[PDB]
Nucleic acid binder design. Structure first.
Lengths: 148, 111, 24, 103, 124, 146
RNA sequence: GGAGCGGAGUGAAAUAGUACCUGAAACCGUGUGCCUACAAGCCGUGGGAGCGUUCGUGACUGC
RNA sequence: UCGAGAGGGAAACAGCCCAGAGCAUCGACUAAGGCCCCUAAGCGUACGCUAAGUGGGAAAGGAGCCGACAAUGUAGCGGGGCUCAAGCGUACCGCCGAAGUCGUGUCAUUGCGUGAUGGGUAGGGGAGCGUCGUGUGCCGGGUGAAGCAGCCGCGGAAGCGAGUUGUGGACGGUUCACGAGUGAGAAUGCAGGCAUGAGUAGCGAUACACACGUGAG
């Protein structure tokens, strides 16, 4: 219907196949049948299932002793080196997740560039990030904000 | 002593070219020129022009000047890019006409 | 009249063999 | 000279040293020894065909190999209905070397 | 996500045409016409493969009957006598003796003849 | 193991002479076709000719029971319209006996490209004299079994 | 005559030569192993001798 | 019973007779039907009938016979041939004969090692192969990836090979999930290329010939 043209019947005892339009599905350059269309893929999941899943993911990490807490990421000046040294002391594993309040620019700016570190607010801690990450590191302000 | 030449995109239909190239398989090189010389077919002209390059290559490139110990080792005609044009005919219709071409190859080796 | 079937490769080539030139 | 032995609902002609292919003997491992019930013995002009005599003669053979035969391709088909069943099969066999034909 | 069905479709086309290498004419070049015929080749394989068992038994009876009539006993009664001597030996190998080892087969007709009843047509 | 299939050289053809003096025509043909087909020896196979040459003397004195001599025809059509030509065996056996015996045996054999090769091993004659005296033919009596 | 080609040269690569990355199938050829001119063939399949650069072909025969 | 049913027989012959195919088997016994040759197994044994090739088509009626009689070519036994039955009847003996049954090996559904079960169209249910892409962990690649062409192996099927060779010259494998423009042989289907007809029909309406010249022709 949307392909440009094809409004005419191509021809009439012609001895060929019967065709209703040059833009029929079987024609080269014709329209697509049961093709894709724009659509939202989001799903309505119950609130309790979401919260329970995050609790399960965090509990799984805790049981294996992969939750850590720090009073801060960097003291004073912003330094990707200071954050790199701190995280090296904590863990040498590939995937690390840093939970810190968004009002603490020092931690965000210092750690955002590290290839392996994924940063989140306490309020937007989510199941996918927890499972991907080998270790979870909270700032004390973040930890209390989350638990409360 | 295999030395060969070939003419590509020679405007003569492959079957008409094969009609003549099938005469010159496995004879002495000079004796083949004396056959394409006195040959009615019109394809015998391009074919003999290729048979002379093969001998010229044998003499020059590989230094086998004596062109009397040579025989046609290989000779074959390959199909070439066909051209397509139309022809108006009765009652408004049109039939296609294909102008075929061919690739003629000739190979002379020492006896 | 019209050809009823596509001529088999064997039958086609039996005939074209007859379309040969003679050695002078 | 040679003896006739039955090996799994099948008869065979065997002489000492022959390697013969028989239906799988699942109970026997490679190198094991199996006794085959003989049905005829031919030693030159002497032909022993008495079943009571033969009941005591057992041809001794050694399990040489466990192998599978060539693959056979199978097709069920009936026209105009669309029925078509495709299937494959490899029959499993045991090779045994005949060692002794007691007289 | 559009899928071009060329890497997947060819997988069976080569399989059929490899099974079709050998067919005469157009059954060994064209997938469609080759795939109608390898269907017939497999069905004939099934039938003849299951029907050579009776084919070979026919060939064995012919040889057994020919050899038995050389010794003056028809295949009709040479088998019955063998039954009445409990010397059951498969036709596969009973016909393998007639060709190579005539003496052994000659020794078996002797047993089959003596295991028959004196008058074969009298009431059982 | 595999059942023996005769190779080209396992066959040793012999020469049989069947005197057909007052012997039923049908029983002559069956006996001659058995030998011709090689179906009397243990080396038989269904795809190779193993039979023996069969000379037939006295092919003009085949006894024919009942009214066959004056009732049984031998039809032969030529392809042209109204080309059927039949022949009573009284006429056929009078002057072409060999052509009637050989026709009988031909029917008692496969009609393939091998049965015609078998049929070439059968010489039919009307007298007591056959030229094939250098092949050392062995007289062959017609007998039955128990 | 030209076209085109054979040497030569550039290039890592010239069956990458401006008709040009990869280059399938239908289709068309050359060489080569086997069979094929007394034979009736939904062109296959079972049995099977022979020949040959397990494999290739397949005299003859059953379906 | 076919439809939706393979296999054997009736010469061929969906619906008739025998028999219900999971797969392999160069073992055995049988069913309908057969055992002179084509064609597996009896020129079977014994008694009796048929003279018409009846068997191998038919009526009133007449004294196994007559009645009997259409068109391409024998043609109303499948053919040869058959009464020296290889025909019909009645006994006796034996054998051949299917994918049936038994024997042997192997897989699958189902109920409790064992029992039963596994033809199948419309249709219902289950388990999977392959293509592309995404997230994830683990891996490969100028020491030669994808794609294509073979060779050698593997699987019950769709199919596979982190085997190998050639071509090729920069992108792939795989676990668990997730999404689909996810599988074509047919729609007088659509587009491109190429065959058959075939070196065939045609080359489009009245006349050009000679000498010389140019010219590679």
């Amino acid at each position: 219907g949307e392909v440009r043209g094809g409004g005419k019947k191509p021809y009439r005892g012609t001895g060929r196949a019967r065709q209703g339009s040059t833009r029929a599905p079987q024609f080269a350059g014709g329209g697509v049948v049961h093709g894709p269309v724009p659509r939202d893929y989001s799903q309505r999941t119950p609130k309790k299932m979401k919260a329970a899943a995050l609790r399960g993911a965090l509990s799984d990490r805790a049981r294996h002793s992969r939750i850590h807490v720090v009073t801060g990421v960097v003291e004073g000046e912003i330094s990707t080196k200071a954050a790199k040294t701190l995280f090296g002391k904590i863990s040498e594993r590939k995937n690390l997740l840093l939970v810190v309040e968004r009002s603490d620019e020092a931690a965000w700016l210092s750690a955002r560039n590290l290839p392996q570190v994924h940063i989140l607010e306490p309020g937007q801690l989510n199941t996918y990030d927890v499972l991907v990450s080998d270790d979870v590191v909270f700032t004390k302000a973040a930890f209390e904000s989350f638990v409360s | 002593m295999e030395a060969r030449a070939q003419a590509r995109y020679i405007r003569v239909t492959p079957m008409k070219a094969r009609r003549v190239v099938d005469l010159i398989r496995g004879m002495d090189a000079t004796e083949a020129q004396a056959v394409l010389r006195f040959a009615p077919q019109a394809a015998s002209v391009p074919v003999k022009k290729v048979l002379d390059s093969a001998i010229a290559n044998a003499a020059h490139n590989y230094d086998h000047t004596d062109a009397s110990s040579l025989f046609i080792s290989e000779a074959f005609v390959d199909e070439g890019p066909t051209l397509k044009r139309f022809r108006p005919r009765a009652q408004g219709r049109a039939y296609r006409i294909r102008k075929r071409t061919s690739h003629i190859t000739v190979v002379v080796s020492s006896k | 009249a019209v050809p009823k079937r596509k001529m088999s490769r064997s039958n086609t080539r039996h005939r074209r063999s007859q379309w040969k030139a003679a050695v002078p | 000279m040679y003896a006739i032995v039955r090996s799994g609902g099948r008869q065979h002609k065997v002489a000492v040293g022959d390697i013969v292919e028989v239906d799988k003997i699942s109970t026997a491992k490679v190198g094991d020894t199996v006794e085959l019930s003989t049905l005829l013995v031919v030693d030159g002009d002497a032909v022993t065909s008495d079943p009571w005599v033969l009941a005591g003669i057992k041809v001794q053979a050694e399990v040489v190999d466990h192998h599978k035969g060539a693959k056979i391709d199978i097709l069920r088909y009936k026209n105009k209905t669309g029925y078509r069943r495709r299937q494959g099969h490899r029959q499993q066999y045991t090779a045994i070397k005949v060692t002794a034909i007691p007289t | 996500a559009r899928v071009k069905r060329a890497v997947n479709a060819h997988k069976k086309r080569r399989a059929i045409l490899e099974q079709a290498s050998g067919y005469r004419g157009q059954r060994s070049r064209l997938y469609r016409k080759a795939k109608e015929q390898v269907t017939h080749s497999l069905v004939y394989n099934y039938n003849d493969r299951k029907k050579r068992k009776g084919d070979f038994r026919q060939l064995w009876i012919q040889r057994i009957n020919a050899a038995a009539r050389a010794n003056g006993i028809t295949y009709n009664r040479f088998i019955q006598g063998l039954k009445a001597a409990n010397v059951e030996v498969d036709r596969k190998i009973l016909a393998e003796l007639a060709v190579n080892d005539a003496n052994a087969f000659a020794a078996l007709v002797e047993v089959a003849q003596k295991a028959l009843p004196s008058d074969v047509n009298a009431p059982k | 193991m595999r059942t023996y299939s005769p190779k080209p050289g396992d066959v040793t053809r012999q020469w049989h002479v069947i005197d057909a003096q007052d012997v039923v025509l049908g029983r002559l043909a069956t006996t001659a076709a058995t030998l011709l087909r090689g179906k009397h020896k243990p080396i038989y196979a269904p795809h190779v000719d193993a039979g023996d040459f069969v000379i037939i003397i006295n092919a003009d004195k085949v006894h024919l029971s009942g009214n066959k001599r004056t009732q049984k025809m031998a039809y032969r059509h030529s392809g042209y319209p109204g080309g059927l030509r039949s022949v009573r065996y009284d006429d056929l056996l009078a002057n072409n006996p060999e052509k009637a015996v050989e026709k009988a045996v031909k029917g008692m054999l496969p009609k393939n490209s091998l049965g015609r090769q078998m049929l070439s091993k059968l010489k039919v004659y009307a007298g007591e004299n056959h030229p094939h005296a250098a092949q050392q033919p062995v007289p062959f009596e017609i007998t039955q079994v128990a």
